[PDB]
Design a protein around this nucleic acid. Structure first.
Ligand SMILES: [Mg+2]
Ligand SMILES: [Mg+2]
Ligand SMILES: [Mg+2]
Ligand SMILES: [Mg+2]
Ligand SMILES: [Mg+2]
Ligand SMILES: [Mg+2]
Ligand SMILES: [Mg+2]
Ligand SMILES: [Mg+2]
Ligand SMILES: [Zn+2]
Lengths: 141, 100, 75, 144, 185, 142, 62
RNA sequence: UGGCGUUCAGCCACCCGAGAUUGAGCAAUAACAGGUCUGUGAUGCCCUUAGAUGUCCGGGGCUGCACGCGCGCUACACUGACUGGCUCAGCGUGUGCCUACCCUACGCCGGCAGGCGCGGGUAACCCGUUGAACCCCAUUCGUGAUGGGGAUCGGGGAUUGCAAUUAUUCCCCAUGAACGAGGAAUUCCCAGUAAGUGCGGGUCAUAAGCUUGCGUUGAUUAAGUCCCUGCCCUUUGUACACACCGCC
């Protein structure tokens, strides 16, 4: 019996990234190159497609827990600011880089916000999100 | 026939004596009752200085106040309860009564 | 104290010593080779990525801070 | 291919400024006064160039382009929220200030603030404290 | 598998204690071996309950020092773990024999004190606590402001203490500790 | 119709690891996911000393489901080792003989007492006029 | 000057100006006659083994 | 249970067991010329009392700076900074008397600071199962102050308010400065303890480099002494008794 939960959830996004690259209907926005992703990071992303990774991480936080992740996506993707005075508080994520993403993942059909807020997923996309996991499982020993 | 009677107070033993009074007279008058459900207690914290002035080694007092809360649900009519919430009530105790 | 002027890329012959003698060391790590060859620590990682698929170094561990390459096969 | 090809300089005379020829290009530009770490990766991004190369593997007819981008960072779509000269007082245009202009306009702006006998700026003539700090203990880097 | 105990792919036996003085106060054997060098602690509430902690655990607990290391034991196990790999592939021996040799060759036998000073000898537990503190400090200074991992420092310092090549703050502070108490003994 | 539900708890600091034991195959899973993708991967064999000390035949016939609440990253490991140890002994207690329990208890105890005895240690408060629980502030004269 | 070993048979006290050293009656394991009183640093329990660089001088019992 | 001791009070060791010293609160007779009239509509005497030392409205200062000391913060880097990913907390508060000032989910507009609409909650009922931090796995990286370090002092955007100039706080201009592990001297400290590390409250329209609490990562050494600085009893000596800061 195979699912996402026996796959050592680190390269599951290193093949779900390449699958949302290869299919390539994600509506990358216009301003991709020139953002900080936070108010605590200091540089741009090193990887040239930093948008697909975050779409795969979101698509698994969404597979795992919840139909109510909107600002809890910024509560899960913040970090550590550095004010030059004292260790700073866990700073929030970015509102636009995730509102634009979930509106861009509404372009295909895997997400569906219904009630009690937030975006939840569909069994039809759960088919795809579950079949490549047994692929990685048998292909990694 | 859905009536909840909340007993909240500071005095633990006298609040226990009223919640067991208000259950033993229900049980001795034949109406089904739930248990004496105990909610967790809340505390207060005040930390001040033990000095009017600023002189002396820096020493601080402290102050607390605990509070408890119980609630009891019944299955009864809503007229004899004015008598029931009157038999040996004790000072300090703040009884709430909800019929809705 | 001395200053260190290392090399970014091989001039002509320090590569001609690396392809002659590095594959005959028992301890091939980038902080040992760089003490021998006078090279920067951002180059030894590219040299042992070449000899990985060139197949002469017998990779052992791969922790991000330290790699361990032994000798080759006995014979 | 880990050996030195031709054309591999060690000092790139760029903009009356000597650029090292061994650092990564994302940290080779910062010798220009004004442009630092963030704006460099963008200039080395709007042209589809690798930034995992050394200063000397990039051709001489190709660094006329990253340079033209850094001189004119408008026609190549850089937004209005990067420029360290937004809404100038004298003309009122948006642009970038490079290695010369960043000291030039800076010491013409402090002369402008100085001439009017203004307390914000009549403190550089004294050489003392303004951004709103107290002193009482915090200089003492000499000072008689 | 009756009781084989990898220390991350090593073996507990084939360990030979040379001296008679350090016989029971050094526990690196059958009963005193665990697949990993970590425990819940509680080994200092009594006085001589420390002499039953394995020397692997006491190296781990005494590796982390100076501020930016207080509270990282799960991290400092990994240095030891790569350190025995490097020793196995540079000397080609059992490194738990190498380490017991380095403790022996690194322990002092006397020390000077104040009664102008006069000299006495040392206890075996003193000799363990001293040889460990010594060679661990000498590995750290040689890895401070140096392109060398602390594992490769501990590897060569354990080698030049089971070799005596005068490349060791561990042996080097032994002569200064002995010759001072020798002039005045 | 077997209802052999063996619910065992275990504590470290604030690590309320609850094991569970049914009858069936021999497999272990925690929060659903198996033992591999558990936390620090430097701490792998701390789930195998309940296996490797005894053996892998001792876990034939018992299947395991594990709840976890509270605690940090390490205490959620030292509470999920003691839990399934106390659930093995408590399964041989209630459903099979009490006598073959004593060898398993002896072998687990002759390795470490933590397998069966919780740690009666927690953190400690902060008195007034100090930056900690014992350390006082910098006192300066003159 | 050969290097010898000895054996504790009796602890005596804590001597020094600070109370930082011990005082222990040790025998010798080669010659069961020799037995001297010395002073030893560190934690010492009875019935244990010591080592002597010199084995001629002797402590001052007090 | 053994060991030790007048076979008295007790000490060490051991088994059995979740524990064989957990942590604070309260606290003596007698006394000090300790501090507070700037907490009080607790108060004696003295000055002023209508050109007011009472009271209100406009400003500006208490934040100034050749030097000196005391409490603290970030640091001086590879056990290390930078991008991803991964996965775990416990104490709390929260819509007001005069009182206008709550914690906030969830939908959109924007780089970001935020805004515009919308709903819940007087609270184990919602915010929230409070996806808290280094630590964890894959990424780039100096012997020179380097991507370490990020300060006096330089261009632009939003919020609280009747008002921010001497810049109220946070993102977007920079100088990218001193600092290569610290002298004589000196503080604190023995087990979930030192240290690292983030959260809550208090103060609060605006608000944490202080403080009061909580958690999490978790050590090295010691089971001893009177040498130093001090205290406690018995004996001793005295020309001191406002008492060695003495008297002469
Ligand atoms: Mg900083
Ligand atoms: Mg966080
Ligand atoms: Mg070190
Ligand atoms: Mg008086
Ligand atoms: Mg008065
Ligand atoms: Mg000072
Ligand atoms: Mg510096
Ligand atoms: Mg002292
Ligand atoms: Zn008053």
């Amino acid at each position: 019996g195979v699912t996402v939960k026996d796959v050592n959830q680190q390269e599951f996004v290193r093949a779900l990234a390449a699958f949302l690259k290869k299919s390539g209907k994600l509506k990358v926005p216009e301003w991709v190159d020139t953002v900080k992703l936070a108010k605590h990071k200091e540089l741009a992303p090193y990887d040239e497609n930093w948008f697909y990774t975050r779409a795969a991480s979101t698509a698994r936080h969404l597979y795992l827990r919840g139909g109510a992740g909107v600002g809890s996506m910024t509560k899960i993707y913040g970090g550590r600011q550095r004010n030059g005075v004292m260790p700073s508080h866990f700073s929030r994520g970015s509102k636009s880089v995730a509102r634009r993403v979930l509106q861009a993942l509404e372009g295909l059909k895997m997400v569906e916000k219904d009630q009690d807020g937030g975006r939840k997923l569909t069994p039809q996309g759960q088919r795809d999100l579950d079949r490549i996991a047994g692929q990685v499982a048998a292909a990694k020993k | 026939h859905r009536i909840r009677i909340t007993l909240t107070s500071r005095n633990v033993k006298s609040l226990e004596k009223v919640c067991a009074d208000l259950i033993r007279g229900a049980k001795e008058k034949n109406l089904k009752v739930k248990g004496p459900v105990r909610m967790p207690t809340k505390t207060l914290r005040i930390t001040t200085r033990k000095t009017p002035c600023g002189e002396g080694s820096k020493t601080w007092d402290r102050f607390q106040m605990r509070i408890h809360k119980r609630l009891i649900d019944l299955h009864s009519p809503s007229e004899i309860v004015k008598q029931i919430t009157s038999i040996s009530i004790e000072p300090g105790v703040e009884v709430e009564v909800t019929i809705a | 104290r001395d200053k260190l002027n290392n090399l970014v890329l091989f001039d002509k012959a320090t590569y001609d010593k690396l392809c002659k003698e590095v594959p005959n060391y028992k301890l091939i790590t980038p902080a040992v080779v760089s003490e021998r060859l006078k090279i920067r620590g951002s180059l030894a990682r590219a040299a042992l990525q070449e000899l990985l698929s060139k197949g002469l170094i017998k990779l052992v561990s791969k922790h991000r801070a330290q790699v361990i390459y032994t000798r080759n096969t006995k014979g | 291919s880990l050996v030195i090809p031709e054309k591999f300089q060690h000092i790139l005379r760029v903009l009356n400024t000597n650029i090292d020829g061994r650092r990564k290009i994302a940290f080779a530009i910062t010798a220009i006064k004004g442009v630092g770490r963030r704006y460099a990766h963008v200039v080395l991004r709007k042209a589809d160039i690798d930034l995992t190369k050394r200063a000397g593997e990039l051709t001489e007819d190709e660094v006329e382009r990253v340079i033209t981008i850094m001189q004119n960072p408008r026609q190549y779509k850089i937004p209005d929220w990067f420029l360290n000269r937004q809404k100038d007082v004298k003309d009122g245009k948006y642009s970038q200030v490079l290695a010369n202009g960043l000291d030039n306009k800076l010491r013409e702006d402090l002369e402008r603030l100085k001439k009017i006998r203004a307390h914000r700026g009549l403190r550089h003539f004294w050489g003392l404290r303004v951004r709103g700090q107290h002193t009482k203990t915090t200089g003492r880097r000499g000072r008689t | 598998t009756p009781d084989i105990k990898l220390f991350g792919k090593w073996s507990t036996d084939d360990v030979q204690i040379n001296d008679i003085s350090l016989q029971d106060y050094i526990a690196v054997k059958e009963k005193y071996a665990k697949y990993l060098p970590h425990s819940a602690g509680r080994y200092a509430a009594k006085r001589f309950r420390k002499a039953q902690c394995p020397i692997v655990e006491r190296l781990t607990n005494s590796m982390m020092m100076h501020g930016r290391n207080n509270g990282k034991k799960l991290m400092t196990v990994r240095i030891v773990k790569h350190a025995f790999e490097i020793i196995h592939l540079l000397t080609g021996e059992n490194p738990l024999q190498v380490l017991v040799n380095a403790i022996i060759n690194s322990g002092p036998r006397e020390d000077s004190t104040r009664i102008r000073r006069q000299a006495v000898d040392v206890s075996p537990l003193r000799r363990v606590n001293q040889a460990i503190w010594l060679l661990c400090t000498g590995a750290r200074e040689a890895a401070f402001r140096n392109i060398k991992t602390i594992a490769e420092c501990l590897a060569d310092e354990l080698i030049n203490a089971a070799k005596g090549s005068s490349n060791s703050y561990a042996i080097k502070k032994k002569d200064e500790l002995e010759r001072v108490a020798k002039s005045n003994r | 119709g077997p209802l052999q539900s063996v619910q065992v708890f275990g504590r470290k600091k604030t690590a309320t690891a609850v094991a569970h034991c049914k009858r069936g195959n021999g497999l272990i899973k925690v929060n659903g996911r198996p033992l591999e993708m558990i936390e620090p991967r430097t701490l792998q064999y701390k789930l195998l000393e309940p296996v490797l000390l005894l053996g892998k035949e001792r876990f034939a016939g018992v299947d395991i489901r594990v709840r976890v609440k509270g605690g940090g990253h390490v205490a959620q490991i030292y509470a999920i080792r003691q839990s399934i140890s106390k659930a093995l002994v408590a399964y041989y207690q209630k459903y099979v003989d009490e006598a073959s329990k004593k060898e398993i208890k002896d072998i687990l105890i002759q390795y470490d007492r933590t397998l069966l005895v919780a740690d009666p240690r927690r953190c400690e408060s902060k008195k007034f006029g100090g930056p900690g629980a014992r350390a006082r502030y910098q006192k300066s004269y003159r | 000057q050969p290097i010898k070993l000895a054996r504790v048979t009796k602890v005596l006290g804590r001597t020094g100006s600070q109370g930082q050293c011990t005082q222990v009656r040790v025998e010798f394991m080669d010659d069961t006659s020799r037995s001297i009183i010395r002073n030893v640093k560190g934690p010492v329990r009875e019935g244990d083994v010591l080592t002597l660089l010199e084995s001629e001088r002797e402590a001052r019992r007090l």
